[PDB]
């Protein structure tokens, strides 16, 4: 057994705690250092191997790729940090004036029984000329060194019975922390898309809690060197609008995703599998730095995508395939 991955004690929460960020680039424009989303099932994808010298070089090759259910990231605040001899410390936290019901639920377990006195008087302080809630920005500018944005996911968009919001801190790539806080404030209550941070062929890393076998499993894990193959937009239609297979369909498997994960929002395709099963929230990061190897730098296309259901063994790809061979079906037509 691995010595580093011991003891095997289970994680304390579904969300995996991120404790490392890709340094701090003082020259890059302001951008998010990571992304948050939810994990769906898995599928299959094939692409052309442009890698030189490979056995399957310049040939179509099948690769296993998972699908991450990514809801839009709506900013709710930002957190500043200051260097100290006792380690990094969060000097001040601020919020985006207004908070959705899902965000308020995160602070409540018996939400229905509670009088729902969530963020309210704080908004009353904001409901004026600003003063303290505006001087906090100046205080952050004066002393802060690294600023982490505070965002939550649109859980109600995800097909999850649990409507409680999930929130985590994300560091800002850009320098000039004044610009960091200015951009964060301007983005208060705004919605951020995947294209604003990640991009196709980027070697992102995945971190999440492992599957529980029902103590084996249910522990946080980090997987690095995973290449994105296509930015997905499940809000629209015809997600399979690739250059090949001009018979546009949807990435959703027949009858919906197995067990759970009926995609109804943005999604992303990532090379290989991801730790943990569906219904688990997964955070994405740029993998610190980008390797210069062809396996990490080369860009890839996409073609065949499997759509047959897995509620059994799998056969039918689309409902329109059932005709001709079955003759008459008086029960239906």
């Amino acid at each position: 057994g691995h010595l580093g991955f011991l003891p095997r004690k289970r994680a304390a929460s579904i969300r995996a705690r991120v404790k490392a960020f890709p340094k701090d680039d003082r020259s890059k424009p302001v951008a998010l250092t990571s992304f948050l989303g939810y994990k769906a099932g898995m599928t299959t994808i094939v692409r052309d191997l442009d890698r030189p010298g490979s056995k399957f070089h310049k040939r179509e090759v099948v690769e296993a790729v998972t699908v991450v259910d990514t809801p839009p990231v709506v900013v709710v605040g930002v957190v500043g940090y200051v260097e100290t001899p006792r380690g990094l410390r969060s000097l001040t936290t601020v919020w985006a004036e207004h908070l959705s019901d899902e965000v308020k639920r995160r602070f409540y377990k018996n939400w229905y029984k509670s009088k729902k006195k969530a963020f309210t008087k704080y908004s009353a302080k904001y409901a004026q000329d600003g003063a303290g809630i505006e001087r906090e920005l100046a205080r952050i500018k004066k002393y802060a060194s690294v600023v982490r944005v505070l965002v939550h996911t649109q859980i109600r968009k995800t097909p999850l019975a649990q409507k409680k919001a999930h929130l985590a801190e994300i560091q800002l790539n850009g320098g000039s922390i004044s610009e960091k806080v200015d951009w964060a404030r301007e983005h208060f209550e705004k919605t951020v898309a995947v294209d604003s941070v990640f991009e196709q062929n980027e070697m992102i890393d995945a971190i999440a809690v492992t599957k529980g076998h029902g103590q084996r499993g249910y522990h946080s894990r980090t997987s690095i060197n995973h290449k994105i193959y296509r930015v997905g937009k499940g809000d629209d239609e015809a997600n399979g609008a690739t250059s090949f297979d001009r018979t546009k369909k949807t990435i959703t498997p027949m009858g919906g995703f197995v067990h759970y994960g009926e995609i109804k929002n943005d999604f992303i395709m990532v090379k290989g599998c991801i730790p943990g099963n569906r219904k688990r929230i997964v955070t994405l990061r740029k993998s610190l730095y980008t390797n210069t190897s062809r396996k990490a730098l080369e860009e890839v296309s996409l073609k065949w995508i499997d759509t047959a259901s897995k509620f059994g063994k799998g056969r039918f790809q689309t409902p329109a395939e059932k005709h001709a061979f079955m003759g008459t079906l008086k029960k239906d037509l």
Binding site: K55, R59, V61
Partner: protein
Amino acid sequence: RISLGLPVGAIMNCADNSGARNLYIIAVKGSGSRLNRLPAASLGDMVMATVKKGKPELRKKVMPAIVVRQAKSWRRRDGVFLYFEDNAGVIANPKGEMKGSAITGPVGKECADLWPRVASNSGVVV
């Protein structure tokens, strides 16, 4: 990834006109760190076999043998998962100079590409 299917000593069929009828895989090369679990042959693998039925030169003397078929369903990166007639092999020197002047039956694409001379001596592919 190389599986652990066919073990040492499998009396696989012979598909060459050298006069051999069966190939007993007495020895398998490439057995390095795969301890505890016995090695296994595979398509295009470097293995040696002794012809059970044949002349004395091929009895008690171990010579390399190249496997051209496996019968057992195998995974492929191309996305195909079919299988064909049966497992087969040929007797050749370590450099691939097959003694048999002709080869019968299909030859796996996995081994044909990595053994140019073996493929050249075979007509049926896949």
